[PDB]
Design a protein around this ligand. Structure first.
Ligand SMILES: COc1ccc(NC(=O)CN)cc1
Ligand SMILES: COc1ccc(NC(=O)CN)cc1
Lengths: 264, 265
């Protein structure tokens, strides 16, 4: 991996691993999501971050994912090389955005794209704080000044309002728990595990006959390592689904999302 | 990755990823186990396998893991480079063995080692069988002829008989289920998931104060994607030792037994 010539974005190549592929001999969407997360971390390290700034560590402030949107046109097989380009952008006082472009390293064609919204939070009180002027200045020297969007189109899937699934759900997977492998270096559940949990309630026949083209996921609350999750799905339609992750006990919402699947 | 000069072993380098590390800022034993599996698959591909031979595919035969033994002296941090060397060896009609040596690519020092026993099974009936002469000749051209052991020592930990945990277990983690990420390309539960399930019943205080040095795991039966597992652990012991058992949640059918050795940080 390396920052590009202008130093305002970062590229990295990954050779797809044997254990990273699913039943259709291609990388799972969870493998793709882990690769996006890895190239984002490597971009942060290359420009001097932990992605907390100096002001943020003094104030006990962190960036948290509010939304993840991923569109995949082609999944890579075991042995294939995926090139990922990533960059960040300030969105005023609302927060920050991280975007990705996925390419087949051999042909140079675009095989996918992703966008994510991040909000500022106090790590102890868990209260959202709105971006301050001091923090914005520290982040802007690493971001392109003119807008650079992975999803530019006016009225695109990435900025759609997602509704709350109504009981009863058409499909469900109950009693989902994280294990130690699902936790990051700070003992928090990895954001990619929530994507896996959402997809657990899609029936196996859809997975066997369709490929996932689009996934939009809102993050409302964290799931703790001792929490239990229920995954709910309803067909809204290509096949489209509405999703809800909630705590098994009280029914507290942790995530809501939508998926779009194409017939193979 | 590449086969070595003599073509009888395979080497590969891996840079440790941000999502591959645990609470200690080092690679989890599950990340290590996935890397061993990846370098084993790349070794098989480099010499023409897919690791069924031509005779095995004709007779609906597969290699299945009977035992996995891993010893780690040092865990790599995010950004570190781990070099893994792997090779195979015939063990007569009992089966085959795959061995690994893990090194720090920068210093060249040995940071870990692993050995695994594989038995032949008919894919459909699930019946184990001894290795035939025709199969033996087909993989001996890819194996060193003189013995080459990652665990050469006489009374080494890798060949120890593991007992069956007696109820009640000291610790337990109940209702463990695989998700789609835990399944391989053939929709079978990945062998590394069983290692994670065994470790789920170790208390968090041991994980917070000790590092895993050794893990020996016997594979008795396969867990299906719609099966539920219970993970059981009892302390048997500076060092901490545990006895482990994975069994199906319903009938209590054994799927795995194992032992772990942990050293104080
Ligand atoms: C109430 O505000 C929020 C709280 C939590 C999140 N996200 C996560 O904690 C998921 N990693 C997003 C917004
Ligand atoms: C009946 O004998 C055996 C059955 C299964 C295994 N191993 C695995 O299925 C590992 N996933 C080993 C021996």
């Amino acid at each position: 991996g390396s920052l590009t010539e202008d130093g305002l974005s970062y590229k990295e190549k990954f050779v797809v691993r044997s254990y990273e592929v699913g039943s259709n001999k291609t990388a799972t969407v969870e493998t793709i999501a882990n690769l996006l997360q890895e190239v984002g971390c490597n971009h942060a390290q290359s420009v001097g971050f932990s992605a907390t700034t100096t002001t943020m560590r003094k104030l006990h402030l962190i960036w948290v994912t509010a939304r993840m949107h991923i569109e995949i046109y082609k999944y890579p097989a075991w042995g294939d090389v995926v090139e990922i380009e990533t960059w960040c952008q300030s969105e005023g006082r609302i927060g920050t955005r991280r975007d990705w472009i996925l390419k087949d390293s051999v042909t140079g064609e675009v095989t996918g794209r992703a966008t994510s919204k991040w909000v500022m939070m106090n790590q102890d009180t868990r209260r959202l704080q709105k971006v301050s002027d001091d923090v914005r200045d520290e982040y802007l020297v690493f971001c392109p000044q003119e807008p650079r969007l992975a999803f530019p189109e006016e009225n695109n899937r990435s900025l759609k309002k997602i509704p709350k699934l109504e009981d009863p759900a058409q499909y469900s997977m109950i009693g989902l728990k994280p294990r130690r492998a699902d936790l990051d270096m700070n003992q928090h559940v990895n954001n990619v595990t929530y994507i896996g949990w959402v997809l657990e309630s899609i029936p196996q026949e859809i997975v066997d006959t369709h490929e996932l083209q689009v996934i939009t996921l809102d993050y409302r609350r964290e799931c703790q390592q001792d929490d239990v999750v229920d995954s709910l799905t309803t067909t809204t339609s290509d096949s489209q689904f509405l999703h809800l992750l909630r705590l098994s006990g009280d029914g507290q919402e942790i995530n809501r999302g939508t998926t779009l699947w194409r017939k193979k």
